[PDB]
């Protein structure tokens, strides 16, 4: 643990502090997440335990590399590959001009490949947001922040406090469903795709009810025909306003027919009918993808 020289402090989150550091013996720039195991009345945090355990098995080009884990008496160091900036900063800086369509398609293809690897390894990310997607200078994008990640070898129950940010939240979670599924990650990825296309959030709601109402306004109020079983959801109220679905041409203008069809498959109300990650990887939208 003397092998790294601290260059600066990248940022500090809920439980750990991330430093940008240099590998003294090799010269590789890395990120050191320091989590003080002292001051902990429960042990290694469950979020850290799940993150490290799931990230050790996820060796993918489009998932952040966990190079090394250092376990010390009262602290724990995680060595990650270093990426210069994330997608959120990239679109914040690419505002007023727009990320190009080929770059959008390449980024979405890489995200779907990483998510397909995650789901084929029974890993549910559950925290897909632009601030959690890290890009590099050579044009790669990698999923990161596996703090909410869960293994779904057995069904994963929904918990109110641990949940993705409201803008990328699936309506099944917003109506009080009991179990997670691979559809919520697809919903978040579709919202991110629409955000990249339109340079703004698809559903920038402020509350749970407001988020649900924006979803209903953009996609139409759900009846049992589109989502069988919706009327028996725990928080479904019969008097919900009956908005009508607006055509996707004004939802995502710059996207073409293939992109709009793919996006509408990622935004199905029924989690069962929502397109899966690898089935999305086999969409005509990605017939011409070249990492730029």
């Amino acid at each position: 643990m003397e092998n790294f020289q601290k260059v600066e402090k990248i940022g500090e989150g809920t439980y750990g502090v991330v430093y940008k550091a240099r590998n003294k013996l090799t010269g590789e720039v890395v990120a050191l997440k320091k989590i003080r195991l002292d001051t902990e009345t429960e042990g290694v945090p469950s979020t850290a335990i799940r993150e490290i355990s799931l990230l050790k098995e996820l060796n993918h080009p489009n998932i952040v590399k966990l190079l090394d884990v250092i376990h010390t008496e009262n602290k724990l160091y995680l060595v990650f590959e270093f990426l210069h900036q994330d997608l959120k900063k990239f679109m914040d800086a690419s505002a007023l001009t727009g990320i190009p369509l080929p770059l959008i398609k390449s980024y979405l293809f890489q995200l779907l490949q990483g998510l397909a690897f995650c789901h084929s390894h029974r890993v549910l990310h559950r925290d897909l947001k632009p601030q959690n997607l890290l890009i590099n200078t050579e044009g790669a994008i990698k999923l990161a922040d596996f703090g909410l990640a869960r293994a779904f070898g057995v069904p994963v129950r929904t918990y109110t406090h641990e949940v993705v940010t409201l803008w990328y939240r699936a309506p099944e979670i917003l109506l009080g469903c009991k179990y997670y599924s691979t559809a919520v990650d697809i919903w978040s990825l579709g919202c991110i795709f629409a955000e990249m296309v339109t340079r703004r959030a698809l559903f920038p709601g402020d509350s749970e009810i407001d988020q649900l109402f924006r979803i209903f306004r953009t996609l139409g109020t759900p009846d049992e025909v589109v989502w069988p079983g919706v009327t028996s959801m725990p928080d479904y109220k019969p008097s919900f306003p009956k908005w009508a679905r607006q055509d996707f041409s004004k939802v995502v203008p710059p996207l073409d027919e293939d992109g709009r069809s793919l996006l509408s498959q990622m935004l199905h109300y029924d989690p069962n009918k929502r397109i899966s990650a690898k089935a999305a990887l086999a969409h005509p939208f990605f017939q011409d993808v070249t990492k730029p």
Binding site: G11, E12, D38, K88, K89, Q131, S207, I209, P234, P241
Partner: protein, 307 residues
Amino acid sequence: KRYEKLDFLGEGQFATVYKARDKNTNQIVAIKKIKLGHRSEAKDGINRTALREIKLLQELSHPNIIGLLDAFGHKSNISLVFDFMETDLEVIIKDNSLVLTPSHIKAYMLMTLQGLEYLHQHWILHRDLKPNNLLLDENGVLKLADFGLAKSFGSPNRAYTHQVVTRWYRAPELLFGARMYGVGVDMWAVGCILAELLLRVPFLPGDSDLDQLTRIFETLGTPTEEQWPDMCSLPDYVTFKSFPGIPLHHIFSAAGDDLLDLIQGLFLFNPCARITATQALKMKYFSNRPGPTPGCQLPRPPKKLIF
């Protein structure tokens, strides 16, 4: 040579709270070190919640409001010095060892209401009132804390970010998405805290905003247009089933008549008609016998395998 870190108090998303000594009078203080957050906010400057807390607490001075002793900051990281608070109301509520006699509840309610009246006279809404935000000291003085959500009200056309309290103590007007509100949002949370003190459990523990509204209407009745003149105009209003509601004295069997009247006033569905802190302090409940407990007398908080 100003503060000697001697303990770790707690950890949170916004900041890390630890314990220190002033090295001048050797006073015991709680230092809140503000985190950098995500790297995407590294170009935003000092944390807005920290600035809000500093600016609001530098203009207030009441016994029942947490005092900001110092706001020294390293240019990399800013730290806020508060008085050290021994515990809070949530620990006392959840602690089964101690008993909450009516005088204890009356004293806690009185300290909360006096702090809130001072806060509301300066046109500031706390907006994050909950039992763990009502801290206690060794002398048993309740202080409102966690002013990160607090903001100044009164001036029209000042609708801002949608920061709201946890749903258990959220007023129904906020749950319906109200942008413009007054002291009623703190008054409903005060009524919820009183209900928690009387029951030792959360009064309306919904798991979602819709379920929170469902529980509120099931317990206190779905309000009509007589008791809430413009209910349907709120941006996030939805229609609910006409629940008759439980009579108050059934929920609170040990409560007296004056306490029942105070609870009814705090839980009025009309935010304009809901009783203010000044109105609540003039109520008969606080002037009835017995008197509030003095702050000094308030309570302070399987098998082995043979191998």
